[PDB]
UniProtKB/Swiss-Prot annotation, chain A:
Record function comment: Nitrous-oxide reductase is part of a bacterial respiratory system which is activated under anaerobic conditions in the presence of nitrate or nitrous oxide.
Keyword line: Calcium, Copper, Metal-binding, Oxidoreductase, Periplasm, Signal
Organism: Stutzerimonas stutzeri (Pseudomonas stutzeri)
Organism classification: Bacteria, Pseudomonadati, Pseudomonadota, Gammaproteobacteria, Pseudomonadales
Protein name in UniProt: Nitrous-oxide reductase
Gene: nosZ
Binding site for Cu cation Z3: H78, H369
Length: 574, 581
């Protein structure tokens, strides 16, 4: 007998035990929470435009975003942390954008998005998860929607032979495409095994849909051999993982699974891909150690890799793991989390009369994703569970027609799940991920060599500027490039003069060394705003389209004399 | 007092937090300090489409071109010196705006760019007889006209102005030219007087210059005299703005009808009306004091019955290093942030005034350490004559080691403090993003929200009129209206499907999609995203929302329901080469 009795209060001066990384949902950002307090410590802009830091306005952010900087929106769902040997290594966080078909990488040492890619020749990146073993070499990303190839407006027919969607592999370290695998059907969610050979995804188009399993080794072998095509103007190797006249691809196997299956979750012992049944009141358990036989043609029926199909309740959507042998599954219709024992389910599937269900806990209301601490790793610790519920109804004060999501913290450390905290959140975060405090190591101040602003350092070099010291205004036709340091009471350049119509770039290097002393820069009535934290260089470009005197000021309260940290841009009329 | 709000319990107060440099307003529950909602205002919100939709860009006007704001000062409208829960107003220092939020729908419903000024900072509301005016400070001195011929702040036509906005119409009411500049502002409990601190009586542009004078001032406005001159036509106008402009500067040492200047040290910052209506209290900042202005001495001051403007000061308590802001428990105590000493100091106002008269008395009751460098602070109901003395939030700018490390950028630390007793007790550290400067609390029963939109709501009434020109009944119609290279899609939305599940256009067509959520259930919000076109918006129950974008890519393009949602559809774009060149 072990009780669930962890402390959930983090009082003043006490620190949280875990980091939580929440998807920002339809709002487009990533959020850092402290767990168990469930307080938001930081917002990391990704696909949104952030007025505060200037993400989406600065030259450094728009460089990372590339052409997709033209979009002001994103739709995030699935945040995941890079792994080495099946354990979080604290290097990167990755997240999808369903709205504009992107994957972004966040560097966890600076807590900023440092790379972003628009996945070519697909629409809507939804499902996303990382290779676990030997490390996160690939980011695996589902493109949800079937589209014509090419999508040039000659063919709109979605049953055309060249209409399909694809499974996507991004090189985690370079954030370039690795390869794409054409599949049958629509892709929903995906996960990876604990060896690197296999990955799997639920599919909902084309009484039984499937989980498609990928032999990533076979895909890799084909790419190395050059046995691939390319699509349109993308150099990405494209492999064909569809069935042809009933004949399987080398790259894929289609495992029949009921019914419009949704969640696709790898157990922390590495034994199972568990697909949540959604319309079927079941989960289906695929034995990963039977997949080699499946691909080698030693099994009579792709159904032979199914070793469990527990009946759990109405509307199973997602599954997580406590590392003790239990799975935890959201029941969307019954509005519960059900705790069940995986090996007992496997024995039940063979016909033994054993109850594998341990507990059903009511949640409020209509849970979608759920996440137990370290569940994506072989160190799953069985301490905390968050269930992310879509309808909060009366659980919080009314706030008008739009309601928050209810993210409920549940103590799973003992035999009985216990609901301990209701956390309201904005714009349907949908899913989250937790890490131990000691798995995350952050920088206190920036490195002057940081790649995040290395292109700005390069630009300064071409102008002969030492960013650590210089306060200079460079004139170049109708372009004006202001460079300044900022510290203690004043901007290093307190006034400058331009001509109406000039394109002004302001680059600021914060040379304060004290942690937490962030600077800001706002140009009044010009739509210009950005952050410059200690030892960072930030830059922003705008046109001086209004004659006269225009004030700029430091936005980030950094000193008793904050109100007075200002400068003047004087714009001479045309 | 209950500190922790368990599952199934509700908060006792609403808190409305400024979004700081991030530009939104945030709704929190107090005392849990959890964020219940975000209200987009000056930011572009991917989730609801604020800043992308036609309804939101119509409210923002020309300023819809800006993707940023910088807000500090949220305030709730009042009737007879008590919150009435109708509106929240807030400033934008970055692009010189004031915005109004309707507290029944929890959305920004009006926005104004204040003409002929730069940087709206200080903002507060008339209390009595109700919030007729929104008072807003423009912080920075600029030339008039600001056409690029004169840049000198010492020119006789370089100045800044105090701004009054009609709260109900969200049009300018008047502007008062002042000497110096403007920082924070508050209003009395009669409707006659408003007051603002000034830190730049020097009209300088550099740090040393702004600190030269031993005293700047709080400028006091006789609003009755301003209104009297407006109705008498005794005003001018600047540029193309019709806003009445009154001159509240001194001439050759002679006071204007509209203003008086009370010398106060030094670069004073906070300007806070006591809840009993007795004082404007200016926080001394560079001076380790607050200056207490007796509001009942102001009529005599404006009537020339006092010899020296300092005669309206009846207290100047020495409190500590860097006083910035003051709030009130309704028990006769004031609470002031000490930015340098990093404390909140509780002090008794009537004893501070006695000490000013020389009566040696210790008016300081407690100094509580906060973490670290507090700016604003706010006690529950402090801006009303119902100040209840229960909760206090101090908003500190350096959180240092109070939270887990999250990289070089740190959160702010908004600390909840129990003040219901004689001893202040720190109960909760609340990390927040992007520097909320200030917040405002309301009792749960002071706020009444709608669960479902009204079909005649002015928020989308222009969209209803557009639909009418097309012969469209929005509650029923699922139709595609073609008009040259414009395509206007109108659909209803309710489970199980979009009312229009596919439509075809020509490459380059300008497509407007208008969706009416005809579902009646509450919490059933719909969303709409067009993949790879940067298009996203919310449609809540009985709302009509619309968004306009160019179909610049040939081929098939999926759209889907984001919120609460298969619920998908297809836009088919015929290639330009198959249509007239
Ligand atoms: N495609 C043409 C513009 C055009 C289109 C349709 C009608 C008339 C003109 C170019 O120039
Ligand atoms: Cu803008 S200032 Cu003390 Cu209000 Cu923060
Ligand atoms: Cu930066 Cu004050
Ligand atoms: Ca001064
Ligand atoms: Cl999943
Ligand atoms: Cl257990
Ligand atoms: Cl104030
Ligand atoms: K800060
Ligand atoms: Na990129
Ligand atoms: Na307006
Ligand atoms: Zn999901
Ligand atoms: Zn899901």
């Amino acid at each position: 007998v072990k009780e669930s009795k962890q402390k959930i209060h983090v009082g003043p001066g006490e620190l949280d035990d875990y980091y939580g990384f929440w998807s920002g949902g339809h709002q487009g950002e990533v959020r850092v929470l402290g767990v168990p307090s469930m307080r938001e410590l930081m917002r990391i802009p990704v696909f949104n435009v952030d007025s505060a830091t200037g993400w989406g306005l600065t030259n450094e952010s728009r460089h990372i975003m590339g052409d997709s900087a033209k979009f002001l929106n994103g739709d995030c769902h699935h945040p995941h942390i890079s792994m080495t040997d099946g354990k979080y290594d604290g290097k990167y966080l990755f997240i999808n954008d369903k709205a504009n078909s992107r994957v972004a990488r966040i560097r966890l040492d600076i807590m900023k998005c440092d790379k972003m890619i628009t996945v070519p020749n697909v629409q809507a990146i939804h499902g996303l998860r990382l290779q676990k073993v030997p490390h996160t070499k690939y980011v695996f990303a589902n493109a949800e929607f079937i589209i014509p190839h090419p999508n040039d407006g000659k063919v709109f027919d979605l049953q055309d032979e060249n209409s399909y969607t694809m499974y996507n592999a991004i090189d985690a370290e370079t954030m370039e495409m690795a390869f794409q695998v054409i599949v049958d059907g629509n892709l929903d969610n995906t996960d990876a095994d604990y060896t690197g050979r296999f990955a799997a995804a639920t599919c909902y188009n084309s009484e039984r849909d499937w989980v498609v399993v990928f032999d990533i080794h076979a895909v890799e072998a084909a790419v190395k051999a050059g046995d691939f095509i390319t699509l349109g103007d993308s150099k990405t190797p494209v492999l064909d993982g569809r069935k042809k006249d009933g004949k399987d691809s080398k790259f894929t196997r289609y495992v029949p699974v009921p019914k419009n299956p949704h969640g696709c979750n790898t157990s922390s012992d590495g034994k199972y891909f568990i697909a949540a049944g959604k319309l079927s009141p079941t989960c289906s358990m695929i034995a990963i150690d039977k997949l080699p036989d499946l691909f080698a043609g030693k099994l009579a029926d792709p159904r032979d890799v199914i070793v469990g199909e527990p009946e759990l309740g109405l509307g199973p959507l997602h599954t997580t793991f406590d590392g003790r042998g239990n799975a935890y599954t959201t029941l969307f219709i019954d509005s519960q989390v059900v705790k069940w024992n995986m090996e007992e389910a496997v024995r039940a599937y063979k016909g033994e009369k054993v109850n594998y269900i341990k507990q059903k806990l009511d949640v409020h209301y209509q849970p979608g994703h759920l996440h137990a601490s370290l569940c994506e790793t072989n160190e799953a610790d069985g301490k905390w569970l968050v269930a992310l519920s879509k309808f909060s109804k009366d659980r919080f004060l009314p706030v008008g027609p739009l309601h928050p999501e209810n993210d409920q913290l549940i103590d799973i450390s003992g035999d009985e799940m216990k609901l301990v905290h209701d956390g309201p959140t904005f714009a349907e975060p949908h899913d989250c991920i937790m890490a131990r405090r000691d798995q995350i190591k952050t920088k206190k101040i920036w490195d002057r060599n940081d790649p995040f602003f290395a292109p700005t350092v390069e630009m300064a070099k071409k102008d002969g500027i030492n960013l650590d010291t210089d306060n200079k205004v460079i004139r170049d036709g109708n372009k004006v490039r202001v460079y300044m340091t900022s510290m203690a009471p004043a901007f290093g350049v307190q006034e400058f003069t331009v001509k109406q119509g000039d394109e002004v770039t302001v680059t600021i290097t914060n040379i304060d060394q004290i942690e937490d002393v962030s600077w800001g820069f706002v140009v009044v009535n010009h739509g210009v705003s950005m952050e410059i934290s200690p030892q960072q260089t930030s830059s922003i470009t705008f046109v001086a389209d209004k004659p006269g005197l225009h004030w700029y000021y430091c936005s980030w309260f950094c000193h008793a004399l904050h109100m007075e940290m200002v400068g003047r841009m004087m714009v001479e009329p045309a």
